[PDB]
Structure 1
Amino acid sequence: TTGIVETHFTFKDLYFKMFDVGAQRSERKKWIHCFEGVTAIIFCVALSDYDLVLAEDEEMNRMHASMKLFDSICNNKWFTETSIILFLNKKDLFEEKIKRSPLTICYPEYTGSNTYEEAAAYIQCQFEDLNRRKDTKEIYTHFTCSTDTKNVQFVFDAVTDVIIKNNLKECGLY
């Protein structure tokens, strides 16, 4: 059935629990305060979606919608001290499609070449600059893929950093 999906896994003696709420097709301003006390918010953004367009509007890049959703959930009144772990996915499809089409299709003021690195850093910067609260929260960004287990390692390290910094703030030492 639909609803929130709950996932458990143990990694280096830590029991990670994750809650997928993509099945919730309703107003998010009525249940998002339930997740007020979460260690981190893992946000997935597909890099290969700059060329694509959402069929609902036919003039709406899915990357712009991802940016809107990320900004909405980042600067929420409840997540004022919660860290966000960004996952820029499908780096390979981006690698070929940037060779085919420039990133100017999505952002009209890109002003750059068609190499993977410039566009990747550009999308990362455009996402991270949407963090208006640059004092009490941090964004950790990855590029995933690699068909490996480095993703859980990155999540573990980022969660450990979040926990340590939370303790430091609670002590006043940060």
Structure 2
Amino acid sequence: LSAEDKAAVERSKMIDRNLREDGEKAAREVKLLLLGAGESGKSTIVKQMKITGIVETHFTFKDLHFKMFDVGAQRSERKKWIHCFEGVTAIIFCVALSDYDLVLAEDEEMNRMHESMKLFDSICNNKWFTDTSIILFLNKKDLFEEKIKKSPLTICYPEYAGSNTYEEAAAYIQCQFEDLNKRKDTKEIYTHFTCSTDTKNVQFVFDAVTDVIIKNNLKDCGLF
């Protein structure tokens, strides 16, 4: 009776202690979701913020433990596994500005920029990510600026009415990507232009995560 049941209860109590410790340790880390249109520059972002199934990358910045998850290798219906990331802190979205002059190889009719915009709209308007913020990275700034001097932007934006300059084209792209967001009151989008040499992306992600965690703490305290 006692000699076995009480030993089992002690084992269960030790298991409970270990489980609570592991849960706290996991809660210490910040979870991030990385998305992109195949080759929008995810590899660059990954190798920048650093000190076959899902790929998890751990990196620490300003004493804050990050846990970024890359799901591009799944190549399966996102609808059946997108709900797993309901609790991620923020979403890092990568888009290559050069996608305006490239057509999808599998389609040959739709531009890569349109596919990226569709994916961004699907992710933003997702019911699971209603409160999750998005960090939009517009990669390939230099290559996009170089190409704009030769290929007009109207190839993929027939409604575009502006000069063929980097500033106006980038502003138009950012406004288009931000307009897709419907819940502009609860959700906030942080847009930033990046290259292969700039390292300020980590500080941008850190600021976004700090804002998100401050909002979460205010909500938990009942202030927000």
TM-score normalized with structure 1 length: 0.96
Moved more, 157-166 or 42-51: 157-166
Runs of 4+ in 1 over 4 A off after TM superposition: none
2: distance between equivalents of 1:110 and 1:173? 43
The Cα shift of 1:67 comes to 0.1
The Cα shift of 1:37 comes to 0.2
Three-state SS of the structure 1 residue aligned to 2:101 is coil
Three-state SS of the structure 2 residue aligned to 1:149 is coil
Cα 1:6/1:146, change in 2 over 3 Å: closer
8 Å contact from structure 1 (residues 102, 113) kept in 2:
no
Gaps of 5+ in 1: none
| Bigger CA radius of gyration | 2
The Cα shift of 1:164 comes to 1.1
8 Å contact from structure 1 (residues 40, 82) kept in 2:
yes
* Structure having the larger proportion of residues in helix: 2
Cα displacement string for residues 42-83 of structure 1 (whole angstroms, at most 9, x for unaligned residues)? 000000110011111111100000000000011001001000
Gaps of 5+ in 2: 1-51
Three-state SS of the structure 2 residue aligned to 1:80 is coil
8 Å contact from structure 1 (residues 103, 119) kept in 2:
yes
The Cα shift of 1:13 comes to 0.4
> Kindly, what percent of the aligned residue pairs are identical?
95
CA RMSD of aligned residues (A): 1.1
Cα displacement string for residues 10-35 of structure 1 (whole angstroms, at most 9, x for unaligned residues)? 11100111000001111111111100
Cα 1:69/1:95, change in 2 over 3 Å: same
Match 1:64 to one of 98, 108, 114: 114
